[PDB]
Amino acid sequence: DEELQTELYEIKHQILQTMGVLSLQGSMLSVGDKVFSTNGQSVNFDTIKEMCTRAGGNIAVPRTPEENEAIASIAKKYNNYVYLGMIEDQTPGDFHYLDGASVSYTNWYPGEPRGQGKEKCVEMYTDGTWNDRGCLQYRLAVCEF
Amino acid sequence: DEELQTELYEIKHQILQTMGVLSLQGSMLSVGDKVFSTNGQSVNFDTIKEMCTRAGGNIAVPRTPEENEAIASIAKKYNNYVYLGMIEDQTPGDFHYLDGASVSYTNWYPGEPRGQGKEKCVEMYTDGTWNDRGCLQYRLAVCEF
Amino acid sequence: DEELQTELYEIKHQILQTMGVLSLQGSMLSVGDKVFSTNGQSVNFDTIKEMCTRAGGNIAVPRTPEENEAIASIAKKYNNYVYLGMIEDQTPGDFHYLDGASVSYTNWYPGEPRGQGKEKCVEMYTDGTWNDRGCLQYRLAVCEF
Ligand SMILES: CO[C@H]1O[C@H](CO)[C@@H](O)[C@H](O)[C@@H]1O
Ligand SMILES: CO[C@H]1O[C@H](CO)[C@@H](O)[C@H](O)[C@@H]1O
Ligand SMILES: CO[C@H]1O[C@H](CO)[C@@H](O)[C@H](O)[C@@H]1O
Ligand SMILES: [Ca+2]
Numbered sequence: 001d002e003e004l005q006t007e008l009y010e011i012k013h014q015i016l017q018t019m020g021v022l023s024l025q026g027s028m029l030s031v032g033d034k035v036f037s038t039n040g041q042s043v044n045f046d047t048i049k050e051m052c053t054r055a056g057g058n059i060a061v062p063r064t065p066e067e068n069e070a071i072a073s074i075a076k077k078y079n080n081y082v083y084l085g086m087i088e089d090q091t092p093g094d095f096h097y098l099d100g101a102s103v104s105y106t107n108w109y110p111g112e113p114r115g116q117g118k119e120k121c122v123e124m125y126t127d128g129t130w131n132d133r134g135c136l137q138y139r140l141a142v143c144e145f
Numbered sequence: 146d147e148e149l150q151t152e153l154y155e156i157k158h159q160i161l162q163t164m165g166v167l168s169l170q171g172s173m174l175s176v177g178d179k180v181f182s183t184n185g186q187s188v189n190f191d192t193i194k195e196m197c198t199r200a201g202g203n204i205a206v207p208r209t210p211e212e213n214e215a216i217a218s219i220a221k222k223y224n225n226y227v228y229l230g231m232i233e234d235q236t237p238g239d240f241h242y243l244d245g246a247s248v249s250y251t252n253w254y255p256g257e258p259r260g261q262g263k264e265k266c267v268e269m270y271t272d273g274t275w276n277d278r279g280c281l282q283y284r285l286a287v288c289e290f
Numbered sequence: 291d292e293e294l295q296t297e298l299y300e301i302k303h304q305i306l307q308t309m310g311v312l313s314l315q316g317s318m319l320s321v322g323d324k325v326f327s328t329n330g331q332s333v334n335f336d337t338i339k340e341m342c343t344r345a346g347g348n349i350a351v352p353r354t355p356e357e358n359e360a361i362a363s364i365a366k367k368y369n370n371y372v373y374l375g376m377i378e379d380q381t382p383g384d385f386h387y388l389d390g391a392s393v394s395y396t397n398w399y400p401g402e403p404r405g406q407g408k409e410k411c412v413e414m415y416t417d418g419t420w421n422d423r424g425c426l427q428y429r430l431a432v433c434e435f
């Protein structure tokens with residue numbers, strides 16, 4: 001109806017306002033329909049995952065060059081590597097998103113991955129390239145919503 | 146209709162994103178349908194009330210164990226007592242929410258309350274238990290929305 | 291319908307919560323339907339404009355006394371002048387909003403403006419009054435959404 005179109009207008013305006021404030025202050029990065037954010041903490045994979053799910057999101061994982069660059073800027077900003085939301089399959093060298101799906105977009109640093117199943121996790125260098133590594137290091141916690 | 150179901154989807158997704166960012170960064174605590182937050186200030190009862198109403202909320206008051214524990218964690222976090230949204234009735238020993246209703250859930254520290262009408266307000270210890278006290282002390286301002 | 295009225299209720303409640311948290315923590319100022327916010331940075335006009343548009347908003351411009359006072363408080367808070375969203379027309383002494391429209395509400399400091407076309411921009415003093423100035427100074431970035 002009409003009164004509905006009005007309601008939805010204010011609602012959408014208010015959401016734009018809150019998101020604008022959050023982005024202006026650098027509390028989050030918006031890329032397409034995905035929002036990235038970090039609590040500034042450096043912890044291991046399992047810890048990061050918990051923090052993200054607890055906030056209603058998931059450990060971040062880039063699926064496009066633009067998403068990858070957004071995460072890289074946060075890593076650069078806090079000057080620390082970032083654990084991405086993906087783990088190695090049974091067959092070494094092969095990685096999958098946590099939902100199980102096979103990884104499509106990748107940005108491995110030349111030569112990577114090369115840990116032969118010893119390094120199940122994936123960390124992002126400050127330049128955005130990836131490196132498979134063990135899941136017990138302390139990495140910047142970056143979540144996506 | 147259909148286009149409406151689509152609109153509402155993005156709107157709900159965007160709200161989840163902003164709330165997720167706010168919770169991930171510890172700017173707020175979500176418990177059920179209630180959101181708690183503090184400006185980090187330590188002021189008296191009347192001041193806190195003003196700050197909260199000015200932000201569009203109310204001075205926090207726990208009505209369930211989970212809500213009580215959420216507030217307690219903030220008190221613990223800032224290491225300071227928290228004034229709760231409730232005041233003593235005419236009959237000492239009896240307290241009511243600011244809307245007038247009688248207090249149901251309580252978590253008095255053993256022996257409390259025992260100020261015999263001299264202490265109209267209620268402060269929360271860092272362990273979550275309550276103590277009736279005067280309303281002129283400087284306590285962490287915690288609001289609920 | 292009914293289920294819709296319910297959906298919209300939670301949505302509106304959640305927006306109030308996020309906006310309340312943001313205002314309680316001083317991350318933004320709400321005046322009517324306008325929200326003001328600053329990233330705390332001091333840069334020139336062109337830079338500010340970019341930062342604001344990038345966050346989904348615009349460089350702030352007061353159109354009412356209340357809006358003017360809100361911006362002034364931010365300037366006072368960060369103790370710095372604020373560039374407003376307006377520039378001088380061809381005819382010196384005349385200013386227009388960036389959308390082109392003619393400026394209606396004004397709050398020039400006594401004697402201002404008086405740069406005779408040499409100062410195309412407008413800066414706000416910490417007391418809220420305006421002064422036309424060059425657009426190359428470093429001013430607090432305040433955006434409106
Ligand atoms: C000890 O090996 C480390 O360095 C190589 C090359 O940098 C990485 O591939 C590996 O995952 C470890 O981070
Ligand atoms: C001086 O009394 C104080 O201590 C007792 C016991 O701790 C409280 O009950 C009371 O409200 C005051 O805080
Ligand atoms: C050098 O002139 C400066 O001071 C006058 C008066 O304060 C302003 O009008 C002008 O824009 C400049 O800021
Ligand atoms: Ca490796």
Ligand SMILES: [Ca+2]
Pocket residue numbers: 257258259260264276277278
């Ligand atoms: Ca007492």
Ligand SMILES: [Ca+2]
Pocket residue numbers: 402403404405409421422423
């Ligand atoms: Ca001037």
Ligand code: NA
Pocket residue numbers: 088092093113114115116117118119120132
């Ligand atoms: Na490996």
Ligand code: NA
Pocket residue numbers: 233237238258259260261262263264265277
């Ligand atoms: Na009492």
Ligand code: NA
Pocket residue numbers: 378382383403404405406407408409410422
């Ligand atoms: Na001028």
